[PDB]
Coordinates of C-alpha atoms in Angstrom, one line a residue:
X321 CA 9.6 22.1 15.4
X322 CA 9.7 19.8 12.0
X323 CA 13.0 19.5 9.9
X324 CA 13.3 19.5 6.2
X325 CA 12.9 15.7 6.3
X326 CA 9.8 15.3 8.5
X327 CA 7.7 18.4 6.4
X328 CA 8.3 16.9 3.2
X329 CA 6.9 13.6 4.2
X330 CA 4.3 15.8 6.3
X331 CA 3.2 17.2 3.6
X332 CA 3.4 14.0 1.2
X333 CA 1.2 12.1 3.3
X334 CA -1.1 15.3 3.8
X335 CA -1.5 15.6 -0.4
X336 CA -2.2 12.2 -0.5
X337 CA -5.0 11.9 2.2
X338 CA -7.0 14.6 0.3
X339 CA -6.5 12.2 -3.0
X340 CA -7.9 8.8 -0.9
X341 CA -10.4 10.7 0.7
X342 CA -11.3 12.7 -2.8
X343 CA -10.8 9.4 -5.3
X344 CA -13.0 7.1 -2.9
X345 CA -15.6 9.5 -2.8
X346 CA -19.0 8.3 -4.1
X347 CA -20.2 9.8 -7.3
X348 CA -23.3 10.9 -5.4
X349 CA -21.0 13.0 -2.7
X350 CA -20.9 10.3 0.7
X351 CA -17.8 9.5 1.8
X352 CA -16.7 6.0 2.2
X353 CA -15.7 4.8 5.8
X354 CA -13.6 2.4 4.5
X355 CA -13.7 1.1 0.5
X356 CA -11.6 -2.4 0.6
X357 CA -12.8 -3.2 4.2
X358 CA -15.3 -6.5 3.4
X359 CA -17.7 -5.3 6.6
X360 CA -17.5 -1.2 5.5
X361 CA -17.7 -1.5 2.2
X362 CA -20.7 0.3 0.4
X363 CA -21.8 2.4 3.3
X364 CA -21.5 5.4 4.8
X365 CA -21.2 6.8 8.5
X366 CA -22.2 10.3 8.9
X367 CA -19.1 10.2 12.0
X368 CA -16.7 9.2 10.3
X369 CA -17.9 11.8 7.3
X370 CA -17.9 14.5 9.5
X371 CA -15.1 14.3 10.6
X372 CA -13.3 13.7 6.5
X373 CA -15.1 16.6 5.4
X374 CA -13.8 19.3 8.0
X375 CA -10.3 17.4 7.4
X376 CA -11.0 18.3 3.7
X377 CA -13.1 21.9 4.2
X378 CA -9.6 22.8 5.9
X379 CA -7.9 21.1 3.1
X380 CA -9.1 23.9 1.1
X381 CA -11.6 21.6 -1.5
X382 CA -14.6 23.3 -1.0
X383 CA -16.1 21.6 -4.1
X384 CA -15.3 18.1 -2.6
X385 CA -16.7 19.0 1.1
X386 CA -19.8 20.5 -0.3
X387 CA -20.8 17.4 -2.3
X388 CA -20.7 15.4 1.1
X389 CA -23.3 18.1 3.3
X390 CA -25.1 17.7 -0.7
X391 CA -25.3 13.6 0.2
X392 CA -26.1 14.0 3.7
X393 CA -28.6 17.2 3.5
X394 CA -30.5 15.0 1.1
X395 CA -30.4 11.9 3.1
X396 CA -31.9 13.7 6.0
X397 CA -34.6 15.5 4.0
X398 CA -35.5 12.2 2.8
X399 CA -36.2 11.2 6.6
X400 CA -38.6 14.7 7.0
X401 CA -42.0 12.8 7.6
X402 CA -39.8 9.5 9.4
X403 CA -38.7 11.9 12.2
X404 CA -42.0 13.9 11.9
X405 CA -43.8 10.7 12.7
X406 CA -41.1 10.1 15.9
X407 CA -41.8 13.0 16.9
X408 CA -45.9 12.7 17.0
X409 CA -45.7 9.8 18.5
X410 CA -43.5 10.7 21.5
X411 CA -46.1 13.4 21.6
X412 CA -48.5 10.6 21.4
X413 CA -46.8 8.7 24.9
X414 CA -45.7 6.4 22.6
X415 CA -41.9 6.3 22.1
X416 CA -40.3 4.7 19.2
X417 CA -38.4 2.1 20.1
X418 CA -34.4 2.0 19.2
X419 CA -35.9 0.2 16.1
X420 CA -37.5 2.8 14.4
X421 CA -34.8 5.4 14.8
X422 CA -32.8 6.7 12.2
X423 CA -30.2 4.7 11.0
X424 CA -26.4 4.5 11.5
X425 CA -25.0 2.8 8.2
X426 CA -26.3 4.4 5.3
X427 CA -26.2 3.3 1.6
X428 CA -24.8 5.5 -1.1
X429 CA -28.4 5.9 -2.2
X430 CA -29.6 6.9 1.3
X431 CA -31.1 4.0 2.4
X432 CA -30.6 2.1 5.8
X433 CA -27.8 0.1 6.0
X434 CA -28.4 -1.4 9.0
X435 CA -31.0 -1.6 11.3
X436 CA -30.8 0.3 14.5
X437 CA -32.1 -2.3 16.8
X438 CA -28.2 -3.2 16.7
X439 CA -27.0 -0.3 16.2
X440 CA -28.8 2.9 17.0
X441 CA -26.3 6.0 17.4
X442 CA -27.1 9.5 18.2
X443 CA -24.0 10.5 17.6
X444 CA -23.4 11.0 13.7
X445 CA -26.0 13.9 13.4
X446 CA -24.4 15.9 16.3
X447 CA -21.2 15.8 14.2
X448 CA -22.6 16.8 11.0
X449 CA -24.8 19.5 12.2
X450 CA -21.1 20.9 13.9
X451 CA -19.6 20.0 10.5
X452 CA -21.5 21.7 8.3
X453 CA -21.7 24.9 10.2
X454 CA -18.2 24.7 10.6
X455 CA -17.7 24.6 6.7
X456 CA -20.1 27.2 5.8
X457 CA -18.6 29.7 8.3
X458 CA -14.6 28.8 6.7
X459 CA -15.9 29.3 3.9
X460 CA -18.5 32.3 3.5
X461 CA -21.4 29.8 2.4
X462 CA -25.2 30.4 2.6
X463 CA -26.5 28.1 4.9
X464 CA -29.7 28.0 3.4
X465 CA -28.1 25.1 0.7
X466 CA -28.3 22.8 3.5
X467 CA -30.7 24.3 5.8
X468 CA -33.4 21.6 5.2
X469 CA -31.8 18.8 6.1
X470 CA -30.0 20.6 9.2
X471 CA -33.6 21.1 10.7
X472 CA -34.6 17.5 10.5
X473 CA -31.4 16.6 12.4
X474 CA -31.7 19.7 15.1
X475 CA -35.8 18.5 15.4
X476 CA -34.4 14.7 15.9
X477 CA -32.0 15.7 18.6
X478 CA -33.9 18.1 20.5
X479 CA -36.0 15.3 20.9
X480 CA -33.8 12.6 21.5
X481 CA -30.5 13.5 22.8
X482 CA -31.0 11.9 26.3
X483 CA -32.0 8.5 25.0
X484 CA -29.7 5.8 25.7
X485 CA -27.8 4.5 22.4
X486 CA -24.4 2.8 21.4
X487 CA -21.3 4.4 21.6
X488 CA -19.0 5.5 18.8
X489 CA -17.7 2.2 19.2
X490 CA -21.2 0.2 18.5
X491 CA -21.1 -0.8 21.7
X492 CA -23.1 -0.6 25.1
X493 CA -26.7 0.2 24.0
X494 CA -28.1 1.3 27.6
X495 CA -25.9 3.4 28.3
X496 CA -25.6 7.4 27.8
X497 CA -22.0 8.0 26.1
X498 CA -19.7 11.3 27.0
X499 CA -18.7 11.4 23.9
X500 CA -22.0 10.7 22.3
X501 CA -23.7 13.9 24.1
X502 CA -20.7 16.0 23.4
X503 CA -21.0 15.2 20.1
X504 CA -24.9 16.5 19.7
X505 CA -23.9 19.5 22.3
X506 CA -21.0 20.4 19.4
X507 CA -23.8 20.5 16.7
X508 CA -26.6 22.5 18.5
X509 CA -23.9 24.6 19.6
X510 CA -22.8 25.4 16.2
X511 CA -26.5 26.2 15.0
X512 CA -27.5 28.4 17.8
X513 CA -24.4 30.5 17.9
X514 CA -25.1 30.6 14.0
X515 CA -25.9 34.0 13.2
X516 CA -27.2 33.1 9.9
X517 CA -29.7 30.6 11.8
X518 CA -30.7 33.4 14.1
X519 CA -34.5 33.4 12.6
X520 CA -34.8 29.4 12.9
X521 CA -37.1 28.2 15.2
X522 CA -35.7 26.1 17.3
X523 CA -32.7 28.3 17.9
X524 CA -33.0 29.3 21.3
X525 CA -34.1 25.6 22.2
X526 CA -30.9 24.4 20.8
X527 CA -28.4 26.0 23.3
X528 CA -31.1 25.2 26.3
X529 CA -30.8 21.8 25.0
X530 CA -26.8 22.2 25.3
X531 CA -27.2 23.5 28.9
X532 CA -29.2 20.5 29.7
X533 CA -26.2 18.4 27.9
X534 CA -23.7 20.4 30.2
X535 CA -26.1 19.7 33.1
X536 CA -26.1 15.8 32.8
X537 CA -22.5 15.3 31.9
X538 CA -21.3 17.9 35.4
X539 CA -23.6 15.9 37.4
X540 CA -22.8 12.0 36.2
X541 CA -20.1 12.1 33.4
X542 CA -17.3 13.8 35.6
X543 CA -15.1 11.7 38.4
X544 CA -11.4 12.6 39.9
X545 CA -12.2 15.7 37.7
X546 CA -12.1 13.9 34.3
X547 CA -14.4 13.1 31.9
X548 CA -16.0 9.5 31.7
X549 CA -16.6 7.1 29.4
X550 CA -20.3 7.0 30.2
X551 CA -22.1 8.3 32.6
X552 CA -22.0 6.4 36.1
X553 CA -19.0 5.0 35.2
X554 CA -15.4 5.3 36.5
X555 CA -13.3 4.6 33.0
X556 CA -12.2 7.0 30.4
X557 CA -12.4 6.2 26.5
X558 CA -10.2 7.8 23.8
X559 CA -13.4 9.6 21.9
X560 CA -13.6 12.0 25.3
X561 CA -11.3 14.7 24.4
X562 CA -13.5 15.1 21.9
X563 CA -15.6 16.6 24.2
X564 CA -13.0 19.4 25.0
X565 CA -11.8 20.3 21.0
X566 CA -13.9 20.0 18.9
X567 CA -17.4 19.7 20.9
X568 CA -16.7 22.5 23.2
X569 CA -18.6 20.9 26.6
X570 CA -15.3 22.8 28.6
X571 CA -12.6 25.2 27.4
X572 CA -8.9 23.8 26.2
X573 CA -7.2 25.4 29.0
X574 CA -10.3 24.2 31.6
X575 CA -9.3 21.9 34.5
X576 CA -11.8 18.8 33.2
X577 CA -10.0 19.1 29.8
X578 CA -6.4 19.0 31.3
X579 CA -7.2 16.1 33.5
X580 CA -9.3 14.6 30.7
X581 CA -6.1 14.6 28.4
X582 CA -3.6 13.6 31.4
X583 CA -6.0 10.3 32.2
X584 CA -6.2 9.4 28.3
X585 CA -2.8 9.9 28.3
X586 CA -2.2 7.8 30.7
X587 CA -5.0 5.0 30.3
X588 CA -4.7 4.5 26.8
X589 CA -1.9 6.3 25.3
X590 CA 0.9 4.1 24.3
X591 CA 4.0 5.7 22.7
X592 CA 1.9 7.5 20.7
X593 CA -0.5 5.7 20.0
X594 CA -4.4 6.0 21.4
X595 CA -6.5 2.9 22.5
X596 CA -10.1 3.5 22.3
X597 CA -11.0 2.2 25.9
X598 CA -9.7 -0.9 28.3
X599 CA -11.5 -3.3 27.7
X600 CA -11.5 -3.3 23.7
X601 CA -11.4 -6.2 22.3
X602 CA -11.9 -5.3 18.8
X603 CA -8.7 -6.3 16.9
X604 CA -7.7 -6.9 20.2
X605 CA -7.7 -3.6 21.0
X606 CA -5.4 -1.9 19.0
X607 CA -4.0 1.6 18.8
X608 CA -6.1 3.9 17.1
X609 CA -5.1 6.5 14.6
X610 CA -8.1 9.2 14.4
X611 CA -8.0 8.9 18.4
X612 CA -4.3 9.9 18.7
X613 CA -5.1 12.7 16.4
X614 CA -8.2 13.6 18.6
X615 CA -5.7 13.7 21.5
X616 CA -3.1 15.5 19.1
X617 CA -5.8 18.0 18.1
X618 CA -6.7 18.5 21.7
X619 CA -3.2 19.2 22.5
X620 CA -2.2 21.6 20.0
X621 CA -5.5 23.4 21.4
X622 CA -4.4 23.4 24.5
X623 CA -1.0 25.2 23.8
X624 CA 0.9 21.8 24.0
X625 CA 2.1 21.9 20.5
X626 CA 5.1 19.1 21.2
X627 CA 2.5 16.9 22.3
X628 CA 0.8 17.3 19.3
X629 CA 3.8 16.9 17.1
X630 CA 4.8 13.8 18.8
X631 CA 0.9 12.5 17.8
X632 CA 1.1 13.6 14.3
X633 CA 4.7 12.1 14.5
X634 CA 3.4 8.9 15.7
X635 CA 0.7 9.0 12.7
X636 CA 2.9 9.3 10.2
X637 CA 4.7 6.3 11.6
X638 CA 1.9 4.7 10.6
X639 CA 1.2 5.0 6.7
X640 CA 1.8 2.1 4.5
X641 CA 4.1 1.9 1.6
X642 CA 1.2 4.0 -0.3
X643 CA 0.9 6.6 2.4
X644 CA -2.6 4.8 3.5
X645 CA -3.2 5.3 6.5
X646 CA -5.3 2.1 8.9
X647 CA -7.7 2.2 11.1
X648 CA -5.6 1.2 14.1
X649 CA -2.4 -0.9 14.5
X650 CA -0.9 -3.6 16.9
X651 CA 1.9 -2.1 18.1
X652 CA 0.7 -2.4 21.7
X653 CA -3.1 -4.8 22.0
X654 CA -4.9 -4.8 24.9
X655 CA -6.1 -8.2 24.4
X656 CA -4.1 -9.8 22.3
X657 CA -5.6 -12.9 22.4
X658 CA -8.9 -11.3 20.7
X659 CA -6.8 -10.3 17.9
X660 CA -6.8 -13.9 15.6
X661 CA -10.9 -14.5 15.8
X662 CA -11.3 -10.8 14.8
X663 CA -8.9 -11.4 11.3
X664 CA -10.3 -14.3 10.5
X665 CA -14.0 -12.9 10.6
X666 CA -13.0 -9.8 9.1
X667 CA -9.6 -10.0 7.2
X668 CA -7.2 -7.3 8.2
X669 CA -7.5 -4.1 9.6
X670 CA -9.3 -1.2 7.6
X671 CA -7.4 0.7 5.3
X672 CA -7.4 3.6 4.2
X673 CA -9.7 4.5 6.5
X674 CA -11.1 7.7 5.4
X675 CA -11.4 9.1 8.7
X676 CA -7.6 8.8 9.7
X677 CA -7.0 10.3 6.8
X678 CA -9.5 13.1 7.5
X679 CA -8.2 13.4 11.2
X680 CA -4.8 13.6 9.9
X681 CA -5.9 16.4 7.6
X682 CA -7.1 18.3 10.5
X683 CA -4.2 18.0 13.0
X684 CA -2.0 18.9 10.0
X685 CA -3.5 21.9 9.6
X686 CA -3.7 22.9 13.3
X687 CA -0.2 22.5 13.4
X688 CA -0.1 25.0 10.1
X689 CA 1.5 22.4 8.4
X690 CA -0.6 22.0 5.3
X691 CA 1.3 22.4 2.0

């Protein structure tokens, strides 16, 4: 469904995402989130790493990918007797508050780059404990490289998976996200379907845990048969397909991920490009790349491979004069009178953003479209 024209430059901006994503890679294996962006610079999100490394696992640079579950495996060692000491004292009656959680930003050197009071996020160590398996199962690796640091994350999320946190977004600390809880049902589904993590201890607790993540998200984080933002609420955000491909909470073809994709599509889908949820006012609420490859990816999974194309299409449309690819664009704003305060603050949109570029990689590669 691509002509000569479109799979060369396909394939152009495909080489050059794995040489951002690969150049702007710390020396000490993190991925960037975003190296010229004043409020990203010098840290790392283990989302939006996830996410580059499977984009670069499927690349094919096992060397590059294998450095970043290095970084993060050594991060989360690091945190052993932090989350042992969570752990005693909910055992204690005493839960930690959002404070003392693991962080969200980290340094290059593993340190907290922010403090969780403002931004505490489940999230991130869902997606690397689905990333990691992920790349180890491409790519016939041992586990065991990595196996340390995968148990402090599967011990911190057994624990604390139901805790309310912020969204993807940074936003809306007491509330329980969809896409948040799909993303820690995706990891400890990964590990406890693992059959080289067969022996670990927590194994069977892992996919009772994802039952009990099934469990919450059927009984609040469903309406008019599509997935919710969060739960109790009516709204969809763009991260919930998310929930279908990769995450696995319902099957591609399952009635919740069709009318999942149809209300995205319809709430926050413009010409191609994916909004991240109504009232965004980030940017004033632009159109986000990763999130119309989500949808794209989701698609493709689905059988809808012109739907996909016309994503990926849209994507390319995108890239800069240097094949970068942003963080989101104006095309359509949902608040476009949010936009100015947010450039002057800020300066202008993120990019590259590492995670477009690692998004793209992925729905390239669905589409069998790598070079």
């Amino acid at each position: 469904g691509l002509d000569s024209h479109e799979l060369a430059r396909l394939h152009e901006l495909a080489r050059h995402s794995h040489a951002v994503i690969t150049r702007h890679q710390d020396a000490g294996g993190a991925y960037p989130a975003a190296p010229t962006f004043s409020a990203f610079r010098g840290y790392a999100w283990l989302r939006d790493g996830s996410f580059t490394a499977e984009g670069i696992s499927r690349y094919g640079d096992v060397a590059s990918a294998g450095r970043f579950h290095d970084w993060v495996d050594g991060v989360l060692r690091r945190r052993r007797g932090q989350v042992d000491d969570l752990l005693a004292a909910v055992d204690r009656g005493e839960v930690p508050s959002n404070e003392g959680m693991l962080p969200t930003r980290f340094t290059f050197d593993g340190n907290d780059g922010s403090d969780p009071w403002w931004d505490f996020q489940t999230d991130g160590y869902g997606m690397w404990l689905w990333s990691v398996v992920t790349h180890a199962a491409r790519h016939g690796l041992d586990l065991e490289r990595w196996r340390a640091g995968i148990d402090v994350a599967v011990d911190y999320l057994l624990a604390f998976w139901d805790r309310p946190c912020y969204d993807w977004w940074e936003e809306h600390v007491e509330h329980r996200h969809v896409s948040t809880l799909g993303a820690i049902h995706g990891g400890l589904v990964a590990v406890g379907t693992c059959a080289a993590l067969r022996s670990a201890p927590w194994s069977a607790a892992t996919l009772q845990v994802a039952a009990r993540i099934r469990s919450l998200v059927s009984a609040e984080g469903v309406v008019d048969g599509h997935l919710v933002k969060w739960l109790g609420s009516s709204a969809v955000d763009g991260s919930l397909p998310a929930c279908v491909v990769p995450f696995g909470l319902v099957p591609p073809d399952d009635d919740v991920a069709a009318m999942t994709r149809a209300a995205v599509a319809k709430d926050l889908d413009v010409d191609g490009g994916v909004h991240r949820f109504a009232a965004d006012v980030f940017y004033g609420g632009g159109q986000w790349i990763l999130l119309s490859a989500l949808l794209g990816w989701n698609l493709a999974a689905a059988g809808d491979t012109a739907g996909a194309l016309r994503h990926l299409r849209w994507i390319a449309d995108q890239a800069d004069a240097d094949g970068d690819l942003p963080e989101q664009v104006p095309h359509h704003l949902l608040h476009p009178g949010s936009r100015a305060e947010w450039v002057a603050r800020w300066g202008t949109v993120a990019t590259p953003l590492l995670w477009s570029h690692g998004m793209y990689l992925i729905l390239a590669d669905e589409l069998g479209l790598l070079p």
